[PDB]
Amino acid sequence: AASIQTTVNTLSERISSKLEQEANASAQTKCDIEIGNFYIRQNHGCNLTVKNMCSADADAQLDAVLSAATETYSGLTPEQKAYVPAMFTAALNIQTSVNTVVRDFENYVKQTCNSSAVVDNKLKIQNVIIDECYGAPGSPTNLEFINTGSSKGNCAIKALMQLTTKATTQIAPKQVAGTGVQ
């Protein structure tokens, strides 16, 4: 919703600025890996875009993305933070509480994005496919996938995108074929 959009915009700004100020990246820099298709299977109100902000050092990218996510989470109010654990279990199968979100996300990234079934991906074109996303027709959710140019960096970006899209579906009105549900 509107809280989510504001937070995602902040996250997006922080990741971009972090990559540009701490990972020597730029919108004009040539990317090693390009994003092929970026879509949501059950897309109910989400508008997607891809922003290239590539650089040469994948480890710096990962540190920039993680730092950006940490800062953004920490800046949320307790009420907003309370919605994050549900995002983690449904999107990444991580069971956490508000006080351990940061530590648990850092461990997930380090175990998942620093894992050769990732960095070994010689594919110069990655497709990003998410199962569901929600947005009101009059105020669709705007989601931007920031392409870091590396498989390692994008692994972190994708994890964040999975959490973000899950957040929208979790606050979406509950219904099946227009009839109120559980």
Curated annotation (Swiss-Prot):
Myristoylated. Disulfid bonds are oxidized in the cytoplasm by OPG088 protein. Changing residue 113 to S: 50% loss in virus production. Residues 1-180 are virion surface. Keywords: Disulfide bond, Host-virus interaction, Late protein, Lipoprotein, Membrane, Myristate, Transmembrane, Transmembrane helix, Viral attachment to host cell, Viral envelope protein, Viral penetration into host cytoplasm, Virion, Virus entry into host cell. Disulfide bonds join 31-54, 46-133, 113-155. It comes from the Viruses. It is a single-pass membrane protein. It is found in: Virion membrane. Induction: Expressed in the late phase of the viral replicative cycle. Changing residue 155 to S: 60% loss in virus production. Residues 1-9 are annotated as: Targeting to MV membrane. Its main location: virion. One of its GO terms (biological process) is symbiont entry into host cell. Belongs to the orthopoxvirus OPG095 family. Component of the entry fusion complex (EFC), which consists of 11 proteins. During cell infection, this complex mediates entry of the virion core into the host cytoplasm by a two-step mechanism consisting of lipid mixing of the viral and cellular membranes and subsequent pore formation. Component of the entry fusion complex (EFC) composed of OPG053/F9, OPG076/O3, OPG086/G3, OPG094/G9, OPG095/L1, OPG099/L5, OPG107/H2, OPG143/A16, OPG104/J5, OPG147/A21 and OPG155/A28. Except for OPG095/L1 and OPG053/F9, each of the EFC proteins is required for assembly or stability of the complex. This is Entry-fusion complex associated protein OPG095. The gene is OPG099. The chain holds residues 4 to 185 of 250 of the full protein.
